[PDB]
Amino acid sequence: EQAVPIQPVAGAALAAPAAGQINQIDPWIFQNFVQCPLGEFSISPRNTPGEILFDLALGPGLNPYLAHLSAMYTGWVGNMEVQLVLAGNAFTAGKVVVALVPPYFPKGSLTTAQITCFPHVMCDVRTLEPIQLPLLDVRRVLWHATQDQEESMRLVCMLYTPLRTNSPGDESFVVSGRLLSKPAADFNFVYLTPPIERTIYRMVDLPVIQPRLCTHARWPAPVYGLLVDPSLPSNPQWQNGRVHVDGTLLGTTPISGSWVSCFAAEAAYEFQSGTGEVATFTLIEQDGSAYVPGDRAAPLGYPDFSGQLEIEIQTETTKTGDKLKVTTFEMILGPTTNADQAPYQGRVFASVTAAASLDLVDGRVRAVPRSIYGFQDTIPEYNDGLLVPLAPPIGPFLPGEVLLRFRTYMRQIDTADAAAEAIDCALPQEFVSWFASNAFTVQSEALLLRYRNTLTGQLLFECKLYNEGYIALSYSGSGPLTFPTDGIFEVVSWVPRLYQLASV
Amino acid sequence: EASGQDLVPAAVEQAVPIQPVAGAALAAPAAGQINQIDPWIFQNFVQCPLGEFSISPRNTPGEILFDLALGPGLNPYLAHLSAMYTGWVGNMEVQLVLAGNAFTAGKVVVALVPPYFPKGSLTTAQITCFPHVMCDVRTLEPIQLPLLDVRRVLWHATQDQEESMRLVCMLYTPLRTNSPGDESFVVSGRLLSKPAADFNFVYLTPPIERTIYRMVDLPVIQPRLCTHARWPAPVYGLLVDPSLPSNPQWQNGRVHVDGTLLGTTPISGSWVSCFAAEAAYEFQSGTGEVATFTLIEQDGSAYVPGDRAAPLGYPDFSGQLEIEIQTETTKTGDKLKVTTFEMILGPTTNADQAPYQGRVFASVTAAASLDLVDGRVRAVPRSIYGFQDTIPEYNDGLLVPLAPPIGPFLPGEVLLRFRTYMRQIDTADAAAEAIDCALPQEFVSWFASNAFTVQSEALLLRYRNTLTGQLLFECKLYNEGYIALSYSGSGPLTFPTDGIFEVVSWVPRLYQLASV
Amino acid sequence: GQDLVPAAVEQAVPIQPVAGAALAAPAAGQINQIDPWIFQNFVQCPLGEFSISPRNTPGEILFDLALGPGLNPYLAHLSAMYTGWVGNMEVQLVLAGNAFTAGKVVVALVPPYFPKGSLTTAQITCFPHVMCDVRTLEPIQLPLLDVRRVLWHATQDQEESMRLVCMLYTPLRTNSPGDESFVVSGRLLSKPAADFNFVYLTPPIERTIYRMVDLPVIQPRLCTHARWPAPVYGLLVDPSLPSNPQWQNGRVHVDGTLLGTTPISGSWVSCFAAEAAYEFQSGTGEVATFTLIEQDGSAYVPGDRAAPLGYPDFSGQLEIEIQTETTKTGDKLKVTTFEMILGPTTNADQAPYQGRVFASVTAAASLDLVDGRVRAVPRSIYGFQDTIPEYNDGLLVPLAPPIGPFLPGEVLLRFRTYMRQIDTADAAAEAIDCALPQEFVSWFASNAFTVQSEALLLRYRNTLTGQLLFECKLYNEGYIALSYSGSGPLTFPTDGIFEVVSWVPRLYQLASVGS
């Protein structure tokens, strides 16, 4: 334990008068150093001084045992003990500084000159034993609330003096560092409350479903494969299948997978002595509601591709030659306009080459897709020719990383090509529903996933799932590569955005 | 002391697992004054402002009979004293009185809920996980409980509400009676409280009457000397009737207890069934004289379609309304005159009327083509023919914002109506046309001007005769602005209009009223 | 008799001592003491100037200060190396009255968490208070205790503490026939009390709160117009011009929030970057359509602004020069002149809010050009008017509010520039006014200033002599006001320097300017 210019901090002695209870923790927990989340770093000889190696806030989330225990309590108090472990031999050089930042220091960028003005310790990369530090509870309140995130003391480690070493011709040398912690003797909980299952210290989990038994987020068809291809555009701007990890739906994505590529509208039929019968649809919500224009490109579930598709609705005939018929229309979304389709304004048109008088009843219909002709993976004309609010394009990606896609095949009417079409998505609808319902709390930037075989257990690849809702693989090949669709995705831990993945 | 004690008496079994909590000793070095409370206040238990509740056989386990937030609002003395301070701190003592008949059986649980616990769905499983006490409904002596200031600050703020310990009572076992005769008893429980030794206030401030706690009060006026909120006439009767529709959707006379007005109800009683407009006239060889009214706000402001189905004070009933219009002509011989017009606002007939632009059309049969000038007019009602108690058309088959229908009520609960009569045009009948409202315009003005703060869900009121000083019945005034009472008879019931309504206490929606 | 009750007793405020570092020590990391001689001197507060006028009415608030390190320049300077503070202070008040003036004021100690509505003359005396006469010759002092529910305060936020509020108890009256323009000046000073210290020693950060606002040391001649790419020529006021224009460019907040469509650099004004497409089929003419993007290359998405950054906000006809490449060989990239309409005009739908622009150029042959990115900058203006153009077809777009809300007798200070216009009969030059010039929209959003009050008092001086030209109020919205009751426009020399004095409230009265 190093000497730092700081006073002792009182824990339960300050909180006892105004606390209903003071609860004790298992004494076996005070004897083990456990790995802290986001408490690891690697120093390379190509780093410049001033990089923040780690930044961790005091609280129950540092220890998994305390994070589990906090679900049955109302408050907490006390200090912690922290250990830093460095992996370097006797032929290295470089220095590191670990400082104690007070709870209310402003957030921003620090400088190596400024980091030494805090109570701090300076450590050489040749140190043998782990470095022990205290983490004290500097506060203006008597105790903290477990279900609320407040400001506490921070531990910040920054590179101070650059690493100087020799390296072999195959692999480059790095200095690894890890941080562990445990509660100090002065640490307590406050009030015994019934346990809560949805707490802020809850880890993200994924449904146990094979991708072959999932649904596609852009076209209503089962998923037929997952793959990766650097030749396709690396920054697509799809409006469907976008969802945040915390449970925020981005763009025009609906909760249910049946709303995909379909729209609900009220249809007015006008027979013209020229082209023929024309149906004009005024759009409404799929579940049934008034469409209020806002910051969305189109009503939820609207298709987000450019092409020629047909729709079928339920029609009632007023005259007496029949009583109920099912017809088929044709909607044009090609780069020709000439009909002024404005989904944002809440109106669209379609027509058929049908003779005679076929006036019908305007009583609201649901239009489902039938097929596509000349499909293009480009967003449609949400307005006349002008700009509309829409979700940002997928990205950014680190160098050497490429998006992983779930591909599926739709129908065709086109004559030229005869093999197949292909539409891709970033996540199946099951994941969208899972994230929307669970409403997790994101920690830093992204999650480390793991695709493993169901029965053999062999690891296939490791990827990164960003909070914006895309998966990136570290692939440095040339041609497209597909993967088996029988594995299960597993969550490992939270990782920083600048994290290097293992190559395929 | 008492007659046969085949009951529980003292429930001295608590041993509540909680530590003593420091009160005003921690806040003394942080205040700039020395304050204290009258020592005599510390010496007797007084009824809480929300200290009445009922347990009935129709209740089910898991229902919340009451919940109390720690603070000055549990004591009338402390609630009155809090108007001249910022800051309070300390513990309190509570006495629960529930001593039902010896033929009854049941169990309740009272728990200490700490601050920051989420509010809403509390189940019978979780309530026993808190420090709690088990009570039989037959207990003879009062049950004494502590309420402690568990907190992470030095003191609280009297204005605006913070997080404090709660006292929640849940029905653990359904109430049943062993008596053979025809009925099941109802338990009437009471709450009393007094501050503990180390309770204090912090800093003396000017005494402002309109504070958060206060207490709701009603104007001291007999119902017969009040004006109706749906027709410009004095209130003539106080009635209850189960034969009439039970969930009306009246637009006028609707107000919230906290002050907010709902619908098209105006502040003044002269705006009822009257409207101001810009009036233009035309003559056509068909229908004759056609008058068009562009409706505007009666204070001169323009009418903009918003969250209201119509301008304030618009007639919400249906039928044919005959009104009077003052007109000025340019013809030589006379200058000013008053004409009588008729309008049809009943069922939709062959007419082109759209309240979206605020246009109202009146037709008159005439032989001579009168020439007039478009101007400004205000129309008040004169007669009603073919009256119907239903809302008129506002957008010709399209939904418009409206106040929700009055309700809901407990089983056996029926709405109380204030009844007035109008001048009616009749052909071969003689029955006087009658209309009903929920609250008179005096109460609407009182609520809109005072802007009270509601506490739980409703207010308990008692109607007392002034001539003899006799309480006639008790009723529940809901926060949405309607009064309900328990009645099971078939025929209509009438009450004298010489009484005075009095506020008793705050009650929840599950409170059971006595039969009338 | 037995006891004597004096009729004249000196005023005093009774208090109960409040603990400072004694309460905060067990939970604070450190307790740092300050220089022992800072406790010995009253120093003017950063917000320490106010005025009383006969126009004021009883019940009006003259000032209200909050306890903390922002009342003393030494404490405000020292707070840049600490994260917290605790303790009490003392405040001094001086009034520059006369013998012809009658009036009374009350200074009260309002505690934290008292509702911030409106106080009356009856309620103000229910607080601990001191009653002061405007004819007093000596300063009046009061204490300021740290009444709180926490252990200490955080420097970097305002939080809630004890207030010091002063209101006009009795109307100000002068026995003179009047009305004249007599104004009573009031000044505030403060110092720490025996119990006051800081909490945690941190590196000195210069860009913190309680850092006093400064201005660049640049004469108005050496600045740039914020509404036209030309140097600022004149500085003037004019009461015959509209009081509250709706300019969209050249607007900035004191705290650094860019309001409207104003860019950071001065090279973006009245210029735009867009992807161009040219067409000419039978009778439409050589029409170029532009899909707008940001000048730095980023994509444009409709948001809370009515146009991209730097878009013109004046109505007229614009003539611009665009770098265009022609596909025909033997003639490489040139500059083409294009005429475009800014205001409403039929046969077209100008909607810059939606990223669509239409321009036309006279032609008699093919003159074909290739598509791509282009940047258009102004060349000439015809039919200039100071009205916002048609940002949409028939819809309302978000806009900055009109300037307002000047006190009676206050006009708007304007920076005047002359543009390049095309005329046929009138030979008069075209003039355009701005509220704040360029490098004044900059220097904000670069310094994250905290306003701490309602207005800034500035003094305009001469660099070589020091003669005071005028005093003015810089409101937080980013504009200046001057007290002037004349009819004709009045200009000022443009070779001066703007100097900050202090922070003043809304009701501060400026000395009238004139000759």
Author numbering:
A (entry chain C): 27 to 530
B (entry chain B): 15 to 530
C (entry chain A): 18 to 532
What text does the study give?
The T=3 icosahedral calicivirus capsid is composed of 180 copies of VP1 with a molecular weight of ~58 kDa, which is divided into the N-terminus (N), the shell (S) and the C-terminal protruding (P) domain (1–5). The S domain forms a shell around the viral RNA genome, while the P domains form protrusions emanating from the shell comprising A/B and C/C dimers. The P domain is further subdivided into P1 and P2 subdomains, with the latter containing the binding sites for cellular receptors and neutralizing antibodies. At conditions found in the gut (i.e., low pH with high metal ion and bile salt concentrations), the P domain rotates and drops onto the shell with intra P domain changes that enhance receptor interactions while blocking antibody binding.
